[PDB]
Amino acid sequence: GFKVKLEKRRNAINTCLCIGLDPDEKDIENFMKNEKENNYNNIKKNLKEKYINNVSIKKDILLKAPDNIIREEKSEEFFYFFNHFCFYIINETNKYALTFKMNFAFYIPYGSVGIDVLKNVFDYLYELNIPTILDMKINDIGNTVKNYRKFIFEYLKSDSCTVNIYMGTNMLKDICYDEEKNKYYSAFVLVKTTNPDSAIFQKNLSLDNKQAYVIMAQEALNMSSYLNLEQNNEFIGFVVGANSYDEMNYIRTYFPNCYILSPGIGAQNGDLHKTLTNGYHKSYEKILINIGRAITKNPYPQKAAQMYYDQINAILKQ
Amino acid sequence: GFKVKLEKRRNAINTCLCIGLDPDEKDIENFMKNEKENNYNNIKKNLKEKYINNVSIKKDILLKAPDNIIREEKSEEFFYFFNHFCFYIINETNKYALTFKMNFAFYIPYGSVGIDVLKNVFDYLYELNIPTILDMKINDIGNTVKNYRKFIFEYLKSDSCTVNIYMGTNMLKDICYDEEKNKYYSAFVLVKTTNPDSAIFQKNLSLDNKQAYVIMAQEALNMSSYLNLEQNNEFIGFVVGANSYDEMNYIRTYFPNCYILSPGIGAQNGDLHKTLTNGYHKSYEKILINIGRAITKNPYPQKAAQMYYDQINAILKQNM
Ligand SMILES: O=c1ccn([C@@H]2O[C@H](COP(=O)(O)O)[C@@H](O)[C@H]2O)c(=O)[nH]1
Ligand SMILES: O=c1ccn([C@@H]2O[C@H](COP(=O)(O)O)[C@@H](O)[C@H]2O)c(=O)[nH]1
């Protein structure tokens, strides 16, 4: 189960850093141009790694020397460099990551080619046995929602995803549970988001002088109990933005042992000390700190990841 | 623009039926086995049509006789029958449809292969010049959401999509407008959904005893005015479930000329007369009636589409 998988890695590497892998078009251009100019140093390092032989889509193209890809198969150049950029980031930073979070939006805008990269990326992480999150923030009626669950948990074999339950909590019956296989899956529900204008609905809406993000949080756990997730070492957790300090603390108390996923530090202006302190828990896999572009876009991603790794671990010593 | 495109087609065919194309795994097997038993009747009908030549992905596979697909390229069988089922439905029913709405969820569960089909489906509809909707209910921060706008409006060339703005209205700045291209796009935001438990947040949440779906509706239009969509013949509309009769009438009243997209009739228990009467508008493209499984799962989709077509047009007569 996901809680067992999270806990074991946390003991292995003693952090709660969640590394975000959201590659955009310029990241792929820059990666392709740097490798071309520096003798494809990082791609040749990728082709030495163990588990690249265990990806299921277009291994024939992925494993051939880069000199060939330019001159030979011009069609598949983008696929090749897109996939190798993701492998490069994973190879460079994974020792520091408790989990990896891939945002689906970044892998769909080119058509099927990016979903092939997404599949290989999740295949890669599964073989490294690193916990994964798919940031897809899915939402629909029950019958439709089943398709997301197949994609996320059967096809990609992801450990968790993000969910927007604004249309109704019952959708989690067809996300976090599969009656036909008697299987249970973990999800993070959107509670407090880092949009600058997120207060308009999450705070300025109310029931019984309770703000909406609290009502939504409590609905999420009531469904978790009904689905019996925790007994099967799965959970429904919360996405709480790094800047929402008051709510972060409001959540951690009164939901003492809930799992929190927090984005916002780095590219979106943050206070790492204050975010991690308000969300803190002994089992600090319950307070995941997502860092994306601050690592993916840094010229030395290994060094950027280590920096946040050491920063987080220093704060935890309290 | 999408308002001009909707209005021009509505005059041509005089309906507001929105046919939903949400093919599931059983639909693709059932199609494959009926074609296998019936001499590939419908697939051969698909390959005679003009515009199948205007699909962009693996057209070499789509256009070959089905006889070959079984014996030779078996890896590509599923792609072939999935894609041809969609063409079959579109060919059989497009004559009755003001718009087609494709729900993204049904095209992702097998991996990339279904996105190839989604691309070909939108290519096909674009070339028949039938207005399109992608039901993706997208939602994220501004930087991420721009990727959806590229997928929906550049890659698929859709005319509109669905949006969930619960994380914040400002995401519509990076969905319905592209500053670098000075282009504008249309969207439908979720107001009232057909989930049986949809009241719990859309209704039981409020500010100053205005219900959440009302505040969300008005935030959506304030953003439409700020972006100047209606001046560029685009709009931001509302998704209002067919069963939400009271709310339907509240929206059509206090948002008189807004565009409504209503699903729920057919597979999910509906009263078509009452839904369309509460939502009615002279320019009745402003009240799109989605029918999905009631057409796609019916053994004769053409006649089922005609059934709802004639049904809708009769109701539109009594509202004058
Ligand atoms: O409230 C939220 C929910 C999700 N994300 C996602 O988290 C990642 C943030 O990474 P970064 O801002 O560190 O680059 C992006 O994928 C973004 O879509 C947020 O930023 N805020
Ligand atoms: O509140 C909503 C919003 C969207 N849809 C979508 O409308 C379609 C309805 O299909 P059907 O019930 O006509 O088959 C599906 O794609 C579904 O995801 C709903 O049903 N309810």
In the residue annotation, B137 being an active-site residue is answered as: yes
Query: Which stretches does DSSP call E strand in B152-215?
Result: 160-163, 177-178, 183-184, 186-192, 206-207, 210-211
The residue to which tokens 């204008």 are assigned: A197
User: Residues 157..216 of B with a Cβ closer than 8 Å to A: which?
Assistant: 164-171, 190, 193-198, 200-202, 204-207, 212, 215-216
Class in CATH terms, B1-320: alpha beta
Domain ranges for chain B, please list them: 1-320
B269 phi and psi angles, rounded to 5 deg: 70, 105
B169 contacts A200? CB cut-off 8 A:
yes
CA–CA separation, A241 vs A238, rounded Å?
10
For ligand 2, atom 16: residue with the closest CA: B103
CB A222 within 8 A of CB A245: no
Say yes or no: domain A1-318 is CATH 2.20.25.570: no
Cβ burial of B78 (10 Å; 0-12, 13-18, 19+) is middle
- Interaxial angle between packed helices A112-128 and A77-93, expressed in degrees from 0 to 180 and rounded to the nearest 10: 30
Closest CB to B168 among A115, A200, A268: A200
CA–CA separation, B319 vs A237, rounded Å?
49
Under 8 Å CB-to-CB from B35, ≥6 apart: which residues? B41, B42, B43, B66, B81, B84
Resolution in A: 2.6
Identify how the structure was determined. Answer: X-ray
Phi and psi based region of residue A54 (left: phi greater than 0; alpha: psi -120 to 50; beta: remaining): alpha
CB B117 within 8 A of CB B83: yes
Strands B17-21 and A183-184: unpaired
Under 8 Å CB-to-CB from B256, ≥6 apart: which residues? B281
CA–CA separation, A44 vs A100, rounded Å?
23
**Which of B75, B102, B108 best probes binding to A when mutated, by most A CB atoms within 10 angstroms?**
B108
The residue to which tokens 């038993």 are assigned: B37
How many Cα neighbours within 13 Å face the side chain of B251?
38
CA–CA separation, B155 vs B34, rounded Å?
33
CA–CA separation, A290 vs A305, rounded Å?
11
B207 phi and psi angles, rounded to 5 deg: -140, 120
Q: Where are the alpha helices (DSSP H) in B150-211?
A: 199-202
User: Residue A44's CB: how many other CB atoms inside 10 A?
Assistant: 12
Which one of the listed residues A45, A64, A95, A137 is annotated catalytic?
A: A137
Closest CB to B164 among A151, A166, A204: A166
∠ at Cα A219 (A216, A224), nearest 5°? 130
- Interaxial angle between packed helices B301-318 and B272-279, expressed in degrees from 0 to 180 and rounded to the nearest 10: 50
Atom of ligand 1 nearest to the CA of A106: 16
Per-residue DSSP letter, A50: G
Atom of ligand 2 nearest to the CA of B241: 1
Percent of chain B as helix, strand, coil, to the nearest 5: 55, 15, 30
CA–CA separation, B59 vs B123, rounded Å?
12
B189 phi and psi angles, rounded to 5 deg: -95, 150
Which one of the listed residues B137, B146, B203, B297 is annotated catalytic?
A: B137
Please, what's the largest Cα pairwise distance for chain B?
A: 66
CA–CA separation, A10 vs A284, rounded Å?
8
CA–CA separation, B60 vs A243, rounded Å?
52
